[PDB]
């Protein structure tokens, strides 16, 4: 309705929604909306531009959902892939490995676990080929960047590549 009306931009509408109502529900829905086939894909094509417009909500979006959801989001909209891998790529690098417990952990209470990160990359690998190469190469290029070690203790990224077999 508002798209055809063209009075205000949908951006404004969505930003105001986001501020007014319960966020946890809202995000999940948008999520589900990006996946419904077209009915009259203008809807999805507005919301992706809204989301790329607001990174900070997309930081809580990508954080709050389960893995398969956001994975099939990607195979549908190649426009979200390189930014999403960006988010975790930077979430990986802000941990540290303790030798007492052989596990990566974060400093603050709000830092994603090894298991939730493993999970999300887990899902992205069990996906179509047009995302597999992308995620694989984004990890290999971040491995080489952080010393091309071939053992744990050392690179979060080595840990992953290994953990996949």
């Amino acid at each position: 309705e508002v798209g055809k009306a063209e009075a205000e931009r949908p951006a404004r509408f969505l930003s105001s929604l986001w501020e007014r109502l319960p966020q946890n529900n809202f995000l999940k829905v948008i999520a589900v909306a990006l996946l419904q086939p077209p009915l009259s894909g203008e809807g999805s094509q507005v919301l992706v531009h809204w989301l790329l417009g607001n990174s900070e909500v997309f930081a809580a979006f990508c954080r709050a959902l389960p893995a398969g959801l956001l994975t099939l989001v990607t195979s549908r909209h190649p426009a979200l892939s390189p930014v999403y891998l960006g988010l975790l790529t930077d979430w990986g690098q802000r941990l540290h490995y303790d030798l007492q417990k052989g596990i990566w952990v974060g400093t603050e209470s709000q830092d994603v676990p090894w298991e939730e990160l493993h999970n999300r990359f887990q899902s992205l690998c069990q996906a179509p080929p047009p995302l597999k190469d992308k995620v694989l190469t984004a990890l290999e290029t971040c491995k080489a960047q952080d010393g091309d070690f071939e053992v744990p203790g050392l690179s979060i990224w080595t840990d992953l590549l290994l953990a996949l077999r």
Binding site: G102, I103, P152, L162, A163
Partner: protein
Amino acid sequence: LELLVEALNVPAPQFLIEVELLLPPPDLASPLHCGTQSQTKHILASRCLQTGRAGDAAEHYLDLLALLLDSSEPRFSPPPSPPGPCMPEVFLEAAVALIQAGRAQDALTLCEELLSRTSSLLPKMSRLWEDELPYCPLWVSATHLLQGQA
């Protein structure tokens, strides 16, 4: 000790009671317990190595190890006994001597020979994937220490 080695290189029972019959076997605490060539040559190299004669130490150790492994044909020349160090602790002493020489391409044909014989023993480290419970004896972790410093 060098004389002792050469001495232990070189080697009748009366139908009568001589004194020998009544003497006890020496203890290890005695001054009369004298080990074997192999057990001694190990004395030399060990005591050489606490001083800092790495070069001397190194020769001595290789000669120890030569004796022990290469003996299939002659009389058995044995290891230092299990009040002494265990046979893999001897390959480590060899390597630490070789590093303080600066023979590091040798301090690796040591650490590699050792884990190539005992692979079948070593832990499979698939606990690496599944991450206290599994088991690896300190001489392995140590062979990776000295493989490293080389």
